Design a protein around this ligand. Sequence first.
Ligand SMILES: CNc1nc2cc3c(=O)[nH]c(N)nc3c(CCc3ccccc3)c2[nH]1
Ligand SMILES: CNc1nc2cc3c(=O)[nH]c(N)nc3c(CCc3ccccc3)c2[nH]1
Ligand SMILES: [Zn+2]
Ligand SMILES: [Zn+2]
Lengths: 359, 359
Amino acid sequence: DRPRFSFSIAAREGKARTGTIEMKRGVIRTPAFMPVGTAATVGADIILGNTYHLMLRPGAERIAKLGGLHSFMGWDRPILTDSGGYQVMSTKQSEEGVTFKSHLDGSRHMLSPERSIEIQHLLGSDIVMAFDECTPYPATPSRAASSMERSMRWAKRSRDAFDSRKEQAENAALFGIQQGSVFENLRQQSADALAEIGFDGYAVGGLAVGEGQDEMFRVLDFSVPMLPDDKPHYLMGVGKPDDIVGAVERGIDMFDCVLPTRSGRNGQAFTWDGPINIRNARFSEDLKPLDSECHCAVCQKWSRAYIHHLIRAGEILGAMLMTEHNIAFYQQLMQKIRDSISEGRFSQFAQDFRARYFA
Amino acid sequence: DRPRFSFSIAAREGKARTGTIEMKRGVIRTPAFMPVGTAATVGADIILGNTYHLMLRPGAERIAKLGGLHSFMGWDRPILTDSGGYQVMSTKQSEEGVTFKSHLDGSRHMLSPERSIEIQHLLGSDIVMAFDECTPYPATPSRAASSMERSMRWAKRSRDAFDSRKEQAENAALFGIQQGSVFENLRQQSADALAEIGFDGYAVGGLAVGEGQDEMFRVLDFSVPMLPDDKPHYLMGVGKPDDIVGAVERGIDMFDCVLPTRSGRNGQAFTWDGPINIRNARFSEDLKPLDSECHCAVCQKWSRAYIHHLIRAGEILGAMLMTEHNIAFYQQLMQKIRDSISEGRFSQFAQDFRARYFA
Ligand SMILES: CNc1nc2cc3c(=O)[nH]c(N)nc3c(CCc3ccccc3)c2[nH]1
Ligand SMILES: CNc1nc2cc3c(=O)[nH]c(N)nc3c(CCc3ccccc3)c2[nH]1
Ligand SMILES: [Zn+2]
Ligand SMILES: [Zn+2]
């Protein structure tokens, strides 16, 4: 029987790590990419639930009545859920939480650390995020400090709420979220507060909110070493393939991004030679698959020309084939990352990846 | 090696028949439903190409440059194409053909019997439809007669154009299309003209254009017996499951309809208990699959509640799962039809089907 939660590091190269998270519902290979579960018939080891949407439609109590997200979505492996506040802010804030009104039916909703944990419990997720405040970018030092300090109080409330629910405490895991904007001293205080509380994993919050890759990497350079080395590191909201590679070089183990899902519906396909917009007329007679090396089912069977045709014709099949390819590309990227760290050649992989991806 | 075209009738019950069309690319079991090939990753024995759309994007010459529709769409089994005029009328008409302008780029296009056959040749279709005029409904006797007479002249031109192209004549089949609106005497003249020309199969044209099921069936009652018994009978544009059952009772062997494709994107799912609109709130907590007996992959894994959720959330996955189910439902319907004719119990099947479908 697998444990509730165990993270093992099998190999290291610089700050990069590869290993496994064992949970009751499955093993997660790291570095991991975690796709949205509603994106397609989803290989990923864990998928994301969208807490904010699920609160509003059909509601967390209704999901629980239907047997929880695993049964609802037909996915028996781990699920990670966010705590809902980031999405809410993307409103009246107070030390208690956030109040907001639903655009879909006008109903009022409150979100607090306690309610966020209870919603995630009702959804049945395996990895639960603490309820935090994602600080807007840019932030002054004072506002970033005040926000981070509030998040750390909410992290302790999240911990206590999680521990009070026996089924959750015994079967799920709880991640704390570091805040502090781009300021080293605040990132350090945040890390210190989270480690004193104690969590199963640690997320780097407050990034991928408009700062750009150079600044994000600069913050990761000093922020990730502040987190406990022996626990997983999740960079929330990241990202594009080059963002992922650079974040892994800086010690990140887990990733989520809307790019592959959103990109696919808007016509963007990821390839080892960079992204392409398949709607462009230059693909109307291109018989190559979306990517020349990709092993996914789309690239085994259909050409750029056909997928171009489908999307231009407004056919749903075109978007689904694009999304399937993008999700498969990301998983192939993560597998090459894991293999290269385990083989001690990740630095070369990253250099080779960037030379081709940006050519 | 399979023949270019061979239709064999294995069993009969009343006017209903079941059998097989053998073609070089595959065997088609009849009665057959022929789905749109761009609907999903499509079990069907033959799919439809959309001549009218393909003329306009990317163009028939471009499809031929890309290797033909089979290579383009990744489908190595038979493909049927329409002749393009029905779609064009859904314009300046003359004895030569029809002229029309493209909404997508303003280019002018002419469609004649000769050009329609050449386009279908460039597309590489296995079953080629003669170029006809679909008479609007209602039509006066005079207009219906004039239109049918023109269609019969165009049918002879279609035959000659097809026979002039050796690769087409030796590897594809040509169907003639009966017209004559709702008038028995015109349907008879049309049948007589088509049989004197000689075709591989015979379509009943000019129906499913607003007349309603009672009138359609009334026209089929006298029209299908006019066609050669030993060749397949294709009812163009039909239809809903109850339309198909009644048409098979009247001697039809082949079907096409946009319902399963269109219905799926608009929220309509076909079941043995009738159609349902999955977007309806009554399905928000319904844990049953879309249909209780359906063997398709969707109904093996996911609930009405989940598919409801996906469609309401605007997720592409929801429409694709609906479309996959609908196509699978139609193929299960055709298989039950074929089995019941072959077992001599189709009349009972039709009665049982209608009692449950309309309950
Ligand atoms: C696109 N950029 C982006 N930056 C983020 C920062 C934070 C942050 O500081 N705190 C929290 N809690 N979430 C964040 C998220 C949302 C991630 C998510 C949403 C849905 C499902 C699973 C995971 C972010 N996303
Ligand atoms: C929905 N009702 C409907 N009634 C039709 C009547 C005719 C008719 O009298 N003549 C021709 N040639 N086509 C017809 C069609 C289009 C069928 C089609 C389109 C695309 C691909 C494959 C097949 C019809 N469709
Ligand atoms: Zn691919
Ligand atoms: Zn089904």
